[PDB]
Amino acid sequence: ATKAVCVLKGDGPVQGIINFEQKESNGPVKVWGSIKGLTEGLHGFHVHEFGDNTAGCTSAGPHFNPLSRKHGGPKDEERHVGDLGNVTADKDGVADVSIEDSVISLSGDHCITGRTLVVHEKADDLGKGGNEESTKTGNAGSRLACGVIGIAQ
């Protein structure tokens, strides 16, 4: 298996730890961990193109989109590679993350390692919001915490 990891931090209360594991080359990737400091409800959760945190999470650029598709949800055919949908925080402000995804990878052109994982202010509408921005960002709003995805032991 191949593994990766991301420590999420920002300017406010949101912080988290996310692990990635890919059992076989080009296979599905398990994504799991925890994020705290969130408002209760859905928060957009995406891999953004650049692993650049120079000026904070803004430096990461748009959703990782090597195939030049429109924004969608993780279970849509029309999605960005980085479109991992939403995480859900409960009234503890904690999102317990447990995802399996078949489009991200830890190698090749779909590789997310060296890019930035971001948790957003608002829900991602998965491209179903009916304004222009829905099919670009999902209307998920600002970036609360982020980190560069790194190679893990």
Add this chain to the structure above:
Amino acid sequence: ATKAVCVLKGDGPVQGIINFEQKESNGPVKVWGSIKGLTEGLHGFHVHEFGDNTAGCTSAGPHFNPLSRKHGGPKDEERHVGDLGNVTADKDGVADVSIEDSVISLSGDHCITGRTLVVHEKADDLGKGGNEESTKTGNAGSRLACGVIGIAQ
């Protein structure tokens, strides 16, 4: 051609920002930037194996060493891929980083993206210190600041 970036964080603050550029995949990598908050003198400067900062800089593991060599300086044949020598801080606590290196890469087996850059407490003796630990770490001591090396625009 290809670019990467690393935000170093670390108490002091020891903080920095380091840029990487490789004009072609078969070619040297320019490494430049600034680190502040340092004590005057040499500080070991290495790429470590893992881009894991789960528990801080310790989680990054040993120097990146894909070829199973002993520790050295960047000019040596016998070196780790991650061996970038020392940065040298003045009384003002600032090290100006300007390195060109032909062993690290931003693509291929020696790719450093997704791994951790670390600035250390003490000087790296470049493998010439005479104890055993010179041949593993250069006796550069603890990890003052680190960050995961990410893909840049």
